[PDB]
């Protein structure tokens, strides 16, 4: 394939304006907020692009260190806040590969510093069904739009 997955490279230019994943909020995020937030260390942006000097982006994901706590104990984790796949690549299994690439980053970081799980943001029902098909455990009530995958399950995937 022509396509590659990499962390945004700080001193490079990407073709972003043409991107359309079918949800204006994600498109907008990519073309006006993703680069500034990555460079300011707000989040860690990862890109699915064509591997040409022109570097045409066709999908992305974001990562941020986080920690889950309860009410009335803390768990250090990583959150995948945003995931997007351009229309052209939809129905081609690319989105799941991005989650798998995400899982390999989170695993690597657990091996270095000690991270216990991966949390994900599911804003609409179509995404909720996606991460559930990837084995993500759905959370309830106030935590509805969150699903979790343990590091141990991630370890199994690339070790089994």
């Amino acid at each position: 394939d022509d396509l590659t997955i990499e962390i945004l490279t700080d001193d490079a230019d990407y073709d972003l304006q043409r991107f359309d994943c079918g949800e204006e909020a994600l498109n907008l995020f990519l073309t006006t907020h993703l680069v500034r937030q990555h460079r300011n260390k707000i989040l860690r942006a990862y890109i699915l692009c064509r591997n040409t000097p022109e570097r045409q982006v066709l999908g992305y994901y974001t990562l941020c260190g986080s920690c889950f706590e309860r009410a009335a104990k803390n768990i250090p984790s990583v959150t995948l806040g945003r995931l997007a796949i351009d229309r052209s690549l939809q129905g081609q299994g690319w989105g799941a590969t991005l989650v798998a690439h995400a899982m390999n980053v989170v695993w690597s970081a657990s091996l270095a510093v000690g991270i216990h799980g991966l949390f994900v943001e599911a804003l609409n029902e179509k995404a909720h069904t996606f991460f559930k098909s990837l084995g993500f455990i759905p959370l309830v009530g106030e935590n509805e739009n969150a699903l979790f995958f343990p590091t141990k399950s991630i370890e199994l995937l690339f070790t089994q």
Binding site: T79, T97, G141, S153
Partner: protein, 40 residues
């Protein structure tokens, strides 16, 4: 502050606690995505 502080309700908490003690076995779909990642 976008999903960097997960403040879990008692039920959501137990689901995670249980996912750590009984980690899910990777499904057939996820394994496929990992096979694609191998060839890249």
């Amino acid at each position: 502050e976008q999903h960097r502080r997960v403040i879990l309700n008692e039920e959501s908490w137990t689901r995670v606690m249980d996912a750590l003690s009984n980690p899910p076995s990777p499904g057939e779909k996820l394994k496929r995505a990992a096979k694609r990642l191998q060839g890249m």
